[PDB]
Amino acid sequence: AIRKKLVIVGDGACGKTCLLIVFSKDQFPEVYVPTVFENYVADIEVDGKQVELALWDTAGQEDYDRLRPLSYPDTDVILMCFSIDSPDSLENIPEKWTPEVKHFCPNVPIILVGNKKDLRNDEHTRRELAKMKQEPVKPEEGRDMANRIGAFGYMECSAKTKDGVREVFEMATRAALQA
Amino acid sequence: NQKWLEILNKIENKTYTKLKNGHVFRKQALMSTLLYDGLVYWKTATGRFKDILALLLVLLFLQEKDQKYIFAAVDQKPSVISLQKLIAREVANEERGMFLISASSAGPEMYEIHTNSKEERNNWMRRIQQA
Ligand SMILES: Nc1nc2c(ncn2[C@@H]2O[C@H](COP(=O)(O)OP(=O)(O)OP(O)(O)=S)[C@@H](O)[C@H]2O)c(=O)[nH]1
Ligand SMILES: [Mg+2]
């Protein structure tokens, strides 16, 4: 019966709600509602311990910047997200999310999470990306960004593939439990 | 309406709440109706609970001063929420809880409110959505 609070942040449309929902309900948001404020809950077993994770979902749209301070107050772990089909979303990690998270949640551990790991090899994406001298984000890059911002760890996953999802939240819970 | 008349005359007369935009809200604005009222607990930032009369009209939070009511004065926050600026949500953690957000551009505020029962929380959430 241990309680911890996890907050997810990142650019709009980078897959945060899908990751939370897929993890908390195994379902998958079909009708895509941009987020304003939501919270969910899930129970996770880690290293023998039962933990109840409160999952605070936030807006990626900058139009809602002023509401996000309302999710930070008692955070045990941050999932700081970008999307692998959007090297833009990655460059916003140091520019926007890391400065805000460090302001509101100093000393709160951060998991840097690359979402949509499946689309790394989808031509639709990988061609549009080529259409602008771009290409999906690469693990060395994600990992370098994680070292740069001081993250507790680096993790990659696909809500749709579902691959690695579980591993994102095990790592986050290990960080939450960390003194 | 009857209940509303008495609540009103029970409200202490010099009482007001500061809004984030620097305006004020005083009992006089209540002279200009009451949809439902109920006793709840307001969780402060430090995890303390404040006993509160919540009135859905906007949302208004009252504290008791013996047989008088005053506009709540909890952690420098406004005790009145405009319904047009209101975001309302279930506390996933707490079947009795709801989160009530004033999204005011002068400075948003969170209010985490706990009722006595799951049924009463869903009762509050239904009545709040209509407005
Ligand atoms: N292929 C693939 N698509 C995904 C994946 N995750 C999310 N998507 C899709 O991308 C869109 C955005 O996902 P969503 O989870 O709603 O983003 P968000 O980060 O919550 O966006 P916001 O609320 O800040 S505006 C959705 O329509 C969703 O189905 C994924 O892992 N793989
Ligand atoms: Mg979302």
Burial of residue A140 (CB within 10 Å: 0-12, 13-18, 19+) is: exposed
CATH number at residue A120: 3.40.50.300
Sign of torsion over alpha carbons B62, B65, B68, B73: negative
H-helix or E-strand spanning residue A170:
helix A165-177
Distance CA B41, CA B112 (A): 9
Other beta carbons less than 10 A from residue B43's beta carbon:
20
HSE at residue A173, side-chain half, CA atoms within 13 A, is 22
Residue with the two structure tokens 């311990």: A49
Task: Check: CB of residue A67 under 8 Å from CB of residue A49.
Answer: no
Q: A157: Cβ–Cβ under 8 A, 6 or more apart, which residues? A: A19, A113, A114, A115, A117, A163, A164, A165, A167, A168
Strand ranges inside chain A, DSSP E: 2-10, 37-46, 49-58, 77-83, 110-115, 153-156
Distance CA B45, CA A138 (A): 41
* Domain interval for residue A169: 1-179
Known binding residue A150? Answer is no
Shortest CA gap B92–chain A (Å): 5
Does B101 sit within 8 Å of A70, measured CB to CB? yes
* Structural domains of chain B, with CATH: 1-131 (2.30.29.30)
Total domain count for chain A? 1
Task: Check: CB of residue A9 under 8 Å from CB of residue A78.
Answer: yes
Q: Which residues between 80 and 119 in chain B have a beta carbon less than 8 angstroms from any beta carbon of chain A?
A: 87, 89-93, 99, 101, 103, 105, 107-110
Distance CA A20, CA A55 (A): 7
Of the partner residues A38, A55, A70, the one whose CB lies closest to the CB of residue B108: A70
Distance CA B106, CA B108 (A): 7
What is the end-to-end Cα distance of chain A in Å, rounded? 17
Distance CA B48, CA B59 (A): 21
Query: Which SS3 state, helix, strand or coil, does residue B1 take?
Result: coil
CB contacts, 8 Å: A36 with chain B: 87
Known binding residue A139? Answer is no
Distance CA A63, CA A179 (A): 35
